[PDB]
C-alpha cells in the first residue's frame, strides 16, 4: 500500500525480495516480505535478529535498513536498493576484475566488517551473494540473518555458521568459541575470488574435503604454529602438506603486497588472523602501493 513492487530480485527460506518504489516520495528501495503465518517454523525469529542488529549498524558499507512495516500476516523490511550482488557481478564481467576494483571491493568490505567487529557483531555468513554491488562501485555487507552480538561469556556458539566454502579450519574442527577472526577468514576467501576469475578458492564437498583443500594450498599447521589444534572437538590427523606451495597462480591479479594481505587473512590459527582494522592499515591500501 505504501510501496509499489516493480519486480522480483530473488526468494528462498529467507523470504521473497522485490525492487519497490515509495508511493509517497517515489524513491527506489528493496523490500523483504517475511511471512508470520507458519507458527511451526522459525523464519520470523531470524528476521527480528537481523532487525535488532541492522538498527545499530549504520555505515555506508553495511546495507541500510530504512524501516520495518507490519501489515497483513507479513513483515516488510525496507532496505536501500542495490544494483546486484557480487555473484551476478562475477557472471556479468567473465569473473574478470581490474586490480583497482579488486582493491576497492576488499577495502569497502573490510570497512563494513571493521565497523561490525568494533560494534561487537559477528557476521558469520560472508559469501559473494551477501555482498551488494552498485554500478557507481559501492559495496555493502548484507544479510545479518546468521549474525550475532558477542561479549557475554558462553559455553559455545553454533558451529553451523558460514557456508562450507568460506568456513575457517577452527570451525571445521568444531571449535566451541570463535572471535571476529571467523569473518576475516571468509574475507580472505572472497579476496581470492576477486583476484582470480570469481571462483571459490576452497570448494569442498564436505568438512573433510574442505580441510584437505585448505591445507593442500596453505600447508598443514604444525604444533608450533597452532598448539591447540589437536585439542579441538572434531580434530583428526590430516596429511602434512608443505607450506612452500606458491600463491602466484592462485591470485594472478595480486602483486607481493596483495599476496601478503591474503596470507594474513588465511591464517589457519584464528588467533594469528589479521583484524579488519589492521588490514585497512596494510600497505596493499597505502597510496604508495605499486
Amino acid at each position: 500500500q505504501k510501496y509499489e513492487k516493480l519486480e522480483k530480485i530473488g526468494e528462498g527460506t529467507y523470504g521473497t525480495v522485490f525492487k519497490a518504489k515509495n508511493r509517497e516520495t517515489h524513491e527506489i528501495v528493496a523490500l523483504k516480505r517475511v511471512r508470520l503465518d507458519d507458527d511451526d517454523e522459525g523464519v520470523p525469529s531470524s528476521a527480528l535478529r537481523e532487525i535488532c542488529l541492522l538498527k545499530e549498524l549504520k555505515h555506508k558499507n553495511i546495507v541500510r535498513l530504512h524501516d520495518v512495516l507490519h501489515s497483513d500476516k507479513k513483515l516488510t523490511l525496507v532496505f536501500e536498493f542495490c544494483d546486484q550482488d557480487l555473484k551476478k557481478y562475477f557472471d556479468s564481467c567473465n569473473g574478470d576484475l581490474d586490480p583497482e576494483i579488486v582493491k576497492s571491493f576488499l577495502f569497502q568490505l573490510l570497512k563494513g566488517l571493521g565497523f561490525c567487529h568494533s560494534r561487537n557483531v559477528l557476521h558469520r555468513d560472508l559469501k559473494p551473494q551477501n555482498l551488494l554491488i552498485n554500478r557507481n562501485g559501492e559495496l555493502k555487507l548484507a544479510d545479518f540473518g546468521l549474525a550475532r552480538a558477542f561479549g557475554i561469556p558462553v559455553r559455545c556458539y553454533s558451529a553451523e555458521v558460514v557456508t562450507l566454502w568460506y568456513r575457517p579450519p577452527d570451525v571445521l574442527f568444531g571449535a566451541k568459541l570463535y572471535s571476529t577472526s571467523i569473518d576475516m577468514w571468509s574475507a580472505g576467501c572472497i579476496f581470492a575470488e576477486l583476484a582470480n576469475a570469481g571462483r571459490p578458492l576452497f570448494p569442498g564437498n564436505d568438512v573433510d574435503d574442505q580441510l584437505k583443500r585448505i591445507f593442500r594450498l596453505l600447508g598443514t599447521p604444525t604444533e608450533e604454529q597452532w598448539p591447540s589444534m589437536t585439542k579441538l572437538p572434531d580434530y583428526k590427523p590430516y596429511p602434512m602438506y608443505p607450506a612452500t606451495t606458491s600463491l602466484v597462480n592462485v591470485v594472478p591479479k595480486l602483486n607481493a603486497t596483495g599476496r601478503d594481505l591474503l596470507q594474513n587473512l588465511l591464517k589457519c590459527n584464528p588467533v594469528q588472523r589479521i583484524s579488519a582494522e589492521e588490514a585497512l592499515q596494510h600497505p596493499y591500501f597505502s597510496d604508495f602501493c605499486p
Binding site: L36, D39, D40, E41, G42, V43, P44, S45, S46, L48, R49, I51, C52, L53, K55, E56, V68, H70, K73, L75, R119, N120, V121, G145, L146, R148, A149, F150, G151, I152, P153, V154, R155, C156, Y157, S158, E160
Partner: protein, 148 residues
C-alpha cells in the same frame, strides 16, 4: 550464580512490578519460561536449554524496561514475558531460528508482532550494549540479584 536462583529473582521482580496482579505467584513466571525451554528441547528445536545465568540476566534487562507496572491480568503478563523471551531466544539463542507456537498465548497474532517490533525499537540498542559493555552486564546482573 544459579539459574533457579536468578529465575526466582526475575519472578519476584515481576510480582513487585505488576502490583495489580493479586493472585500471581513468583513461581508462575518460572513455570512459563521452563515450559517453553523443555518443549523446544523435546521437539528437537535445540540440543541444549536456552535458560542459563547470562540469558536470564538478558531477559531481566528487557523485562524491567518493557513490562508496565499497570499490566491488568496474569494472561497479559505471560504474553509480554513470552514476547521478551522470544526476542531473547532470537537474539542470544545458538540455533538459527525458533518457532512462534510455544511463545504465543494470544488469539490476536497482530498484537504479538506489534509488541515484538515495539520492544526492538525500545531495546535494540541495550540488547547490543549488554554484550559489548561488560560493566553494563555486571550492573544488570547485580540489579537482578538485589530483587530478592
Amino acid at each position: 550464580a544459579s539459574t533457579s536462583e536468578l529465575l526466582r529473582c526475575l519472578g519476584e521482580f515481576l510480582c513487585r512490578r505488576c502490583y495489580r496482579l493479586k493472585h500471581l505467584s513468583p513461581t508462575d513466571p518460572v513455570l512459563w519460561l521452563r515450559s517453553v525451554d523443555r518443549s523446544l528441547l523435546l521437539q528437537g528445536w535445540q540440543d541444549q536449554g536456552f535458560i542459563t545465568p547470562a540469558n536470564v540476566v538478558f531477559l531481566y534487562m528487557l523485562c524491567r524496561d518493557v513490562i508496565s507496572s499497570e499490566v491488568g491480568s496474569d494472561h497479559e503478563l505471560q504474553a509480554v514475558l513470552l514476547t521478551c523471551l522470544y526476542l531473547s531466544y532470537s537474539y542470544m539463542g545458538n540455533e538459527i531460528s525458533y518457532p512462534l507456537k510455544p511463545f504465543l498465548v494470544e488469539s490476536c497474532k497482530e498484537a504479538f508482532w506489534d509488541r515484538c517490533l515495539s520492544v526492538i525499537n525500545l531495546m535494540s540498542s541495550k540488547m547490543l550494549q549488554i554484550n559489548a559493555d561488560p560493566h553494563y552486564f555486571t550492573q544488570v546482573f547485580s540489579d537482578l540479584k538485589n530483587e530478592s
